[PDB]
């Protein structure tokens, strides 16, 4: 019973890709977004910096926040980013929406889930 029409479409699209492409993450991420908001990911940059690696798309089944320092050149894909988060990330790498990520990689390969 989500209220946000966008989050609702993201979830549908996330299932379409998982069911049609060679992806298990998208459907996986879709299941987590269906869960209650309080369980969704709330991650600061300090965590991405510690477990992410270049050329491996970071996937956050939630929202990315601006605390800490990110240096690695990574493409972070999240449901949403705070203003500061999307700023810091774009400096040393790139911030992308799950909607974009799903389009540039329906198979959902070479990707690491972070929360």
């Amino acid at each position: 019973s989500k209220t946000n029409p966008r989050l609702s479409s993201l979830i549908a699209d996330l299932k379409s890709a998982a069911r049609s492409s060679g992806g298990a993450v998208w459907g996986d991420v879709a299941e987590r977004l269906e869960k209650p908001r309080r369980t969704h990911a709330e991650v600061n940059l300090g965590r991405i910096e510690r477990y992410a690696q270049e050329d491996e798309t970071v996937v956050v089944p939630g929202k990315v926040l601006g605390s800490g320092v990110l240096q690695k050149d990574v493409t972070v894909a999240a449901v949403d980013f705070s203003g500061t988060a999307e700023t810091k990330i774009d400096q040393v790498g790139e911030a992308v929406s799950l909607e974009q990520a799903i389009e540039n990689n329906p198979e959902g390969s070479h990707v690491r889930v972070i929360r």
Binding site: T3, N4, P5, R6
Partner: protein, 246 residues
């Protein structure tokens, strides 16, 4: 994108950049919340007299006369809720907070979202508005503000293939129910919203279902009456630009 500007004759007269806000993703849930809050906030506190039914020394006779232990006075039952003329058990209360809070950010996002729904012809038509135009919203030269006669605004609207919506709002409904006994006998479709910049259009305001506003304070209800996004709007050159920074 770009928006076509029109002169009082209804002829194209250049064009301008449609500001970025009109690109804000449409959020009907946020808009609904904002409208719900403005509507609640103007409701008046009410409630029954707190001593209603309590002005009586009525007492129960207790056991003995084969009667239910109900407070009585002059052989009449009183005070208690099951008694005719007795107090109301859980009536409307004046102390109740009938207002709804709304974070400024969340509210502002709703305005922007409502503004954006205004630029989507399909939505505007889904909302119900009648018109034979493709581009929306309708942008007009600031000279629109200098207009005075209502009919002169009619001519412009007809020249803009947008007057059909006023024909739609030219039907009042006599509501079912007792609202009538309280001064709410009629209701009518919402038509065109005119957003000017200096003062609301006195010339357009009396149009059936028409609403007038100023870019600096046009609100969610203006853009989405009833919380339904996509109102057929007509901005003013300057209004369009001033609205960009809301």
């Amino acid at each position: 994108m770009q928006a076509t500007i029109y002169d009082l004759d209804g002829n194209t007269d250049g064009e301008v950049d449609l500001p970025d806000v009109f690109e804000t993703p449409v959020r009907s849930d946020l808009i609904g919340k904002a409208v719900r809050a403005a509507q609640a906030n103007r409701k008046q506190d009410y409630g029954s007299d707190e001593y209603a039914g309590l002005r009586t020394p009525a007492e129960s006779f207790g056991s003995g006369r084969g009667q239910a232990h109900v407070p009585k006075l002059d052989g009449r039952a009183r005070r208690v809720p099951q008694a005719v003329k007795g107090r109301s058990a859980h009536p409307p209360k004046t102390e109740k907070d009938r207002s709804l809070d709304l974070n400024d950010k969340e509210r502002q996002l709703a305005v922007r979202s409502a503004l954006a729904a205004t630029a989507d012809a399909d939505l505007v038509a889904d909302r119900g508005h009648e018109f034979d135009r493709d581009e929306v919203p309708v942008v007009v030269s600031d000279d629109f503000e200098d207009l005075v006669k209502t009919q002169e605004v009619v001519s412009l609207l007809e020249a803009l293939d947008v007057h059909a919506d006023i024909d739609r709002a030219d039907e009042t409904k006599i509501k079912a129910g007792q609202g009538s006994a309280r001064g709410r006998k009629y209701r009518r479709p919402a038509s065109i919203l005119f957003v000017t910049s200096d003062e609301p259009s006195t010339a357009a305001r009396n149009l059936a279902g028409a609403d007038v506003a100023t870019a600096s304070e046009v609100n969610t209800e203006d853009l989405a009456p009833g919380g339904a996004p996509g109102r057929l709007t007509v901005f003013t050159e300057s209004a369009l630009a001033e609205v960009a920074e809301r």
